């Protein structure tokens, strides 16, 4: 499990907590190509049930 | 069929008599069923249903 770490430390019971957005900004994005992706099902409405519809 | 013996069968001559009966159906067996799109991604439950309907 202690492979997989990636902080330093862990919370101790009174780590304050800083809050980074303390202004609005129109927010500018980058990441790696292979971390967003789009999930996509098809919908079987050409089946026989739908009959009626086209 | 009735009968009768005789030579002389003067005014006793006989009607026809033709009996009937009658046949009707009931309601219809129906088997209803209600699906939505999703679940005919995969249709083997929708053939087995139909089987057992039969």
């Known amino acids: 499990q202690r492979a ?4 330093n430390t862990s919370l101790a019971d009174a780590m304050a907590v800083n809050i980074l957005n ?7 994005v980058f990441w790696a ?7 996509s099902q098809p919908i079987p409405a050409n089946h ?5 519809m086209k | ?10 005014d006793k001559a006989t009607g026809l008599l033709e009996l009937n009966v009658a046949v009707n159906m009931g309601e219809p067996d129906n088997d209803f069923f209600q699906l939505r ?4 991604r995969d249709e083997t439950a929708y053939r087995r ?3 057992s309907a039969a």
């Open chain 2, 1 to 10: 069929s009735p009968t009768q013996e005789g030579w002389d069968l003067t």
């Open chain 1, 22 to 28: 303390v202004k609005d900004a129109r927010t500018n």
């Open chain 1, 4 to 7: 997989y770490a990636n902080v």
């Open chain 1, 33 to 39: 190509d292979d971390a967003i992706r789009i999930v």
């Open chain 2, 49 to 51: 249903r139909i089987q």
């Open chain 1, 48 to 52: 026989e049930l739908f009959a009626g």
């Open chain 2, 37 to 40: 799109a999703d679940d005919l």
